Amino acid sequence: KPQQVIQPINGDPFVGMLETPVTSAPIVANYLSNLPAYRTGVAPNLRGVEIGLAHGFLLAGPFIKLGPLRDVPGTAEVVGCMSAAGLVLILALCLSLYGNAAFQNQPSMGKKTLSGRPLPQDPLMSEEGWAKFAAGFTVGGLSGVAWAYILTQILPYYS
Amino acid sequence: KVKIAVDRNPVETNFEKWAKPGHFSRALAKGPNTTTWIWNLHADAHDFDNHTSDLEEISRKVFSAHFGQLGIILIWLSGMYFHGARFSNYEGWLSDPTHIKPSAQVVWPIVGQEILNGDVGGGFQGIQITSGFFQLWRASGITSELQLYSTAIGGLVLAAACFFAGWFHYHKAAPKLEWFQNVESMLNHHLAGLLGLGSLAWAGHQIHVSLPVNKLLDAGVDPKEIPLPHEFLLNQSIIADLYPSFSKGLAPFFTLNWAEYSDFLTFKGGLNPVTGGLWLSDTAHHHLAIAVLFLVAGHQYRTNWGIGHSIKDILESHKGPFTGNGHAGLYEILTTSWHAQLAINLALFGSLSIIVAHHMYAMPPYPYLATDYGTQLSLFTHHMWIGGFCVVGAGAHAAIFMVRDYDPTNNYNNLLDRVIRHRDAIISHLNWVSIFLGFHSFGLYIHNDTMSALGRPQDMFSDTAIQLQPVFAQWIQNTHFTAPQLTAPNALAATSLTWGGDVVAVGGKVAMMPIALGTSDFLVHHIHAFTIHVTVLILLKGVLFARSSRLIPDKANLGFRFPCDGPGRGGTCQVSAWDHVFLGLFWMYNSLSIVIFHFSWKMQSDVWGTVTDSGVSHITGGNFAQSANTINGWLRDFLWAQSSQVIQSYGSALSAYGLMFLGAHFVWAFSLMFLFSGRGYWQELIESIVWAHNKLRVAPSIQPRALSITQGRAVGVAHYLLGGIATTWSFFLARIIAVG
Amino acid sequence: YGEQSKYFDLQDLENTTGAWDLYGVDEKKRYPGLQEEFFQRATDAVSRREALNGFVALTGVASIALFGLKGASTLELPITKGPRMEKTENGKGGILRS
Amino acid sequence: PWKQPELDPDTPSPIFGGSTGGLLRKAQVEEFYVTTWESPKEQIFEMPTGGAAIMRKGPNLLKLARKEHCLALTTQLRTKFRMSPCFYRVYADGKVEYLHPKDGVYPEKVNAGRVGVNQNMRSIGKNVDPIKVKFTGSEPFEI
Amino acid sequence: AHVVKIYDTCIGCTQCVRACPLDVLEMVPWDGCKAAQMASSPRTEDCVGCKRCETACPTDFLSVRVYLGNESTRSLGLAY
Amino acid sequence: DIAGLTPCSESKAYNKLERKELKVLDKRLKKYEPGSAPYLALQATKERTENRFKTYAKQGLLCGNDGLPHLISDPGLALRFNHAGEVFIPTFGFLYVAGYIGHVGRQYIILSKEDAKPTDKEIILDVPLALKLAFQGWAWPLASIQELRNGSLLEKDENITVSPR
Ligand code: CLA
Ligand code: CLA
Ligand code: CLA
Ligand code: CLA
Ligand SMILES: CC1=C(\C=C/C(C)=C/C=C/C(C)=C/C=C/C=C(C)/C=C/C=C(C)/C=C/C2=C(C)CCCC2(C)C)C(C)(C)CCC1
Ligand SMILES: CC1=C(C/C=C(\C)CCC[C@H](C)CCC[C@H](C)CCCC(C)C)C(=O)c2ccccc2C1=O
Ligand code: SF4
């Protein structure tokens, strides 16, 4: 009974990963598989809505807190939010450019989830699917920026 | 089991192999057809692995090589003692250490060098030294030049004995491989014997010799009437008045009454206010405790009498489930590979030299050493660089072991094999933390520079603006300051004045004062962490990818030091681990240069200075908290605010430092030929010069060839490092001599 | 695949090359049903990459043109404020131009 | 060789641990290489992309992302154990190619069964200057 | 990929094919040398240009020449 | 008095430089007793300074607007005016020794090349032949001229390795 925790993935010592407790932990695997980017059956626009909402809510913070007008009261909370919205628009433009670039061809080989049972094709791995994903990303980012804006207006604590 | 296996007379003592310079290598034994034969001769001179495949002859060779290096170091130490005996002002410096600068090198009046014999005081002229030998000769109680002469002659005698020992232990009586493989006996004899016996001998010398001399020296007694240490050794009456516990006479030692020895084996924190160094009683109890700790640790391993520890059992027994086989074969590697042990010993030696430099700058262990700013700066910088060099060489010899002495038979699922297995993960995570540290240190510096340039100092990362306070380091400082209050109640004061609340000063100059840490110290420390992470990334990648890689799978069969595998795969230049060490040398140079720049600026701006009645005034204006946050502030207020004495050193005692500065600039700049360029252009130029020498029949029999690509890289890195080291040496020494 | 020691079969080469989704599930419409059509109608007018590249550029050029023309001098950016009296003369070694 | 051999899917693989150096996404998208050999006993070898692996008594199978890894393993096996293995190439669509000698008795021999290709009967340095082949699309060494 | 050319100066020490870890070079029978052998490059599309055959070539000038240019996914030595 | 340079004997800046050097050298003299060995070394340095300033003057040397002596390089101008000792005679003085080293290196190269395995002779020097050639190289230009006319100095390029362009 050696308890060989460190083993290759699927018992295959030939490929990149080896199954490690950073990867093979049930909590980590359940948390990563439940993240929106790995919900393959869900439409890519619904993926992008949640992803853009989370990222646009987080990206507002550093702009308000450490912006050039952070010492000016009342105006930092609007300048940080519109700069975060501009950053979300820049990331949406780069996302659309990546969708144009990486999906001008067609993939031919599946993903092969563990012990088989693969679906035909991820809609995220398509051209119009990634375009819908980027659309959901920019809508989610704008809504998250506006939500972080109104959370800086009504507040019981800090900002 | 452990015995002395020695083969008598394996090699005849004759100059037969001295007659033919190329004899260690069969490739060089033919003749010097090309000019690269000479560089291969001086390069493979001490590479004993390709001289022969027998480990026993290699072990004998390296044993006598260490004997020769020991004899060389003993010759150098004897020469330093002779210089202090003959050409020095040590007698004058003993009677006045705070006003007479140390000097132990006297130049000749041959060509204009009389200006280098500076007026160091005490009616003596010479080169103002910086090694701090006078402080050491004041700690170890030395009064007259007769004693230094005796020490020099004894060092010369021991150096001759060491050279004779090397000759004997190679040519006359060479030990066998089983003699060198007695690792347990080696460890026991170099733990209890070497370290423990030396620590106990030094503790006894400090107790019986150095303590009374240093007790009479700081009391105002002139050294002329100070009794010689043999009088203290033989006579208990003279040693009894200075230390009353000697009247007991070894009674408390055997009767377990060691509390009676609290007069000359004290436990005091801080420095002696009269001299500025550590208390000699504290050092005596320290070296005695170190001797105890090494005597007990030197009886751990099992050699011949059953009891003890077997290192193979200790390694094979520590096996943990995320590591598979745990330290399974490392005893077999370390008992058969000289390069693996060389890597381990060089890494630990370099790190311990770094600790030595840090803990001398922190607690000065010598009398009148803290006030002598030049000796402290020189010791810190020198041991800093020697530690860095030993660490880089450790990486190099680890890569050499990886290429040559590593075999896959003994290791299947051990720690070394698994480190080889997940090397890409290690390199990628190290690259991530490298990029992360580089950005949020140097981009912070660039952002501070930009906000200074944009006229917005309130947006900078400074103490006046938004700050990154090093809370952990300041908390450690406060804990160590309050450590004698609760956690070490028997300590008189804090272990160092880095975190203290009092300022000591000898001769009107600040010896050691409390150090404040701010945003700038945070930035420089994380810059240091970034730089060290990059250098360790380069060295570890070179070690890991020396055997095989995704680019070149057969890098193991191509040797350790090879230039390239050709322009294939887009060009595999500098792919060898030797070139990884070649780049790591420059990264080491950048790391240690920035480290010693931080040391010099911080100590000159917040520690070193002259004490006044109205507060304490430092050497600079205390601008480290205001100018070390930006690159331009660093430049202007450290490299331009200082070095004004180096340029104006001409016509004075320190003009040789300016000459050395410009020669170092020359050599540093001359290296970039061997760094930027290649070999084919130089080979074609050499062909044209060969045609020129062929036209009028002065063609050498040896064909002139350009330097090899590895040879050119070695010349470039050597000239670059020598130039940079001498540049910083000249600048630091001239600044600290003309000011401090 | 993976019977006792084999890792290659040439008819299920999707398993041979190591293409595996370590974190992949096929659970459809995890969010509540009324929530999708609010955002599904949000994306359909901007789902096309032509509509999205235009919209980002439309909000790009207009807001960039808004900054400086109207965006500056309302935030009191220190570029359209003007000096009080600084830096008319230049030259510490004499000459004193301007 | 006498008959071109086709690799068997059934053949075992050496025991090995998880190594980061191995097959990448190029194995999925583009082609990858497969090496086969028949062993007399259980010996320890070092993979060109990983650490050490104990191989199986009998047939064996290695997958390498590059042909250079395959020939490095081949040269290591031939030098250490006089092993004489062979490797293949497996494409993305499942096509199998044989690159290790089609004649079967290695490039070191001749076998009088292969035709000289990319061979110039002129001496090196007798090639024409690039001006003589300018604006033609053919290099002087390609003639 | 790269262009590998072998000239008539080859005399057949059958060592340029051992120094190439990519199976680019092969040896064909010939009649212009004592060893009756001549280097050939059938799989010239699999060459990366590492010039190890040039290091192994003992003739002056070299019989085998490798010319760089027109790089591809196999001549660049990427496993990705 | 050529190129606007006054002679060193009649230059005010030359004497001001001498007075400045004597002042700083005597500044260090006040920190030592006259019967000490650093005092004797400083006195010898001052004597060497005074001897150098005296010998540099009254020798035809000149200086201009700096107090530092200048050297005249043009031949003829350094011959009509007494300035040949600056660079004109050191030119032939160096060339004699420079041709000495080149000649003895050539004779050693020629002598070693007519010997079995001559590459060893470059790393294994022989003392009696090298020292004999070292003391038989005083008449280097006389040996150089006679070899130039008869072709033993030079070599036709039909046995000289030339580039293949
Ligand atoms: C207690 C016994 C003892 C002591 C004190 C030493 C001391 C030393 N050994 Mg060690 N050694 C021992 C036992 C001992 N050895 C045993 C039992 C073995 C066999 C397993 C070895 C095998 C060994 C090897 C293979 C090597 C050493 C080396 C060294 C030196 C390292 C240099 C250094 O760190 O600077 C300290 C330097 C000094 C203290 C300078 C003074 C040196 C004095 C003259 C040596 C006196 C100690 C000696 C044991 C006295 C007896 C010898 C007698 C025949 C004259 C050091 C002097 C290295 C070496 O070659 O150096 C000799 C080395 O590579 N040792
Ligand atoms: C514990 C100390 C130690 C020991 C025992 C060894 C032993 C060895 N090393 Mg290691 N090494 C060390 C420290 C050590 N090294 C350090 C600190 C470094 C970092 C710089 C290296 C870097 C290093 C590399 C990169 C390589 C070795 C190699 C070697 C081998 C042959 C070395 C040789 O023949 O040099 C011959 C001696 C010389 C060339 C003389 C050194 C001259 C240097 C270049 C200039 C010194 C200038 C000086 C500082 C100032 C003078 C100024 C000038 C104007 C006069 C041998 C196994 C080589 C090898 O093949 O390993 C198997 C190899 O490739 N080592
Ligand atoms: C001071 C000189 C210098 C600098 C800055 C660099 C920079 C770099 N080298 Mg190099 N290096 C140099 C000299 C230098 N090199 C020399 C002379 C050698 C030969 C010995 C090497 C040897 C060497 C090795 C061996 C390695 C590096 C690596 C690196 C990288 C470290 C990145 C990092 O962590 O920092 C963070 C990044 C920087 C400091 C770059 C500047 C960033 C500024 C602050 C801009 C910030 C963002 C900016 C606003 C973006 C601009 C946008 C614009 C386009 C509109 C980086 C690309 C390592 C690497 O690849 O990374 C792990 C590595 O392994 N270098
Ligand atoms: C005595 C031997 C000798 C002789 C006659 C020459 C002669 C020549 N060399 Mg050569 N040279 C030599 C040795 C020699 N060289 C050596 C040892 C080196 C390596 C450092 C060079 C490197 C060298 C270069 C790189 C170049 C020349 C050039 C030249 C030409 C210009 C003249 C000159 O002074 O060059 C200058 C020569 C040097 C700076 C080299 C000085 C090295 C010392 C003085 C030589 C020591 C030799 C030794 C004492 C002889 C042994 C004596 C014997 C009794 C044992 C001329 C044809 C140049 C050329 O092509 O012009 C057309 C040129 O570019 N030489
Ligand atoms: C530095 C130097 C020097 C000098 C000096 C010296 C070095 C001297 C001597 C010294 C010595 C000479 C020392 C000694 C020491 C000793 C010791 C340290 C001891 C110890 C001991 C122990 C550890 C133990 C013991 C015991 C006991 C306790 C009990 C009983 C048992 C017994 C006996 C075991 C010289 C010149 C030389 C060289 C160079 C350098
Ligand atoms: C300059 C240069 C050369 C040419 C340098 C050579 C051939 C080495 C020359 C060494 C000399 C001959 C050592 C001796 C120097 C002087 C002769 C010493 C004079 C001493 C006085 C007392 C006379 C290379 O070969 C090279 C190779 C690879 C990368 C870069 C370079 C490179 O930069
Ligand atoms: S430039 Fe030099 S190091 Fe780089 S591939 Fe060419 S020959 Fe090798």
Numbering used by the authors:
A (entry chain L): 44 to 150, 152 to 203
B (entry chain A): 12 to 751
C (entry chain H): 36 to 133
D (entry chain D): 60 to 202
E (entry chain C): 2 to 81
F (entry chain F): 68 to 232
Task: Give sentences copied directly from the paper behind this entry.
Multisubunit Photosystem I (PSI) encompasses half of this Fe in its three Fe4S4 centers and is a target for degradation in insufficient Fe conditions, which reduces the capacity for CO2 fixation. TIDI1 (thylakoid iron deficiency induced) is an iron starvation induced chlorophyll-binding protein found in multiple green algae including Dunaliella spp. isolated from coastal Arctic waters and hypersaline ponds. PSI and PSII are each associated with LHC proteins for increased absorption cross-section, LHCA for PSI and LHCB (or LHCBM) for PSII. In this work, we report high-resolution cryoelectron microscopy (cryo-EM) structures of PSI-LHCI supercomplexes from Fe-starved compared to Fe-replete cells of both D. salina and D. tertiolecta.
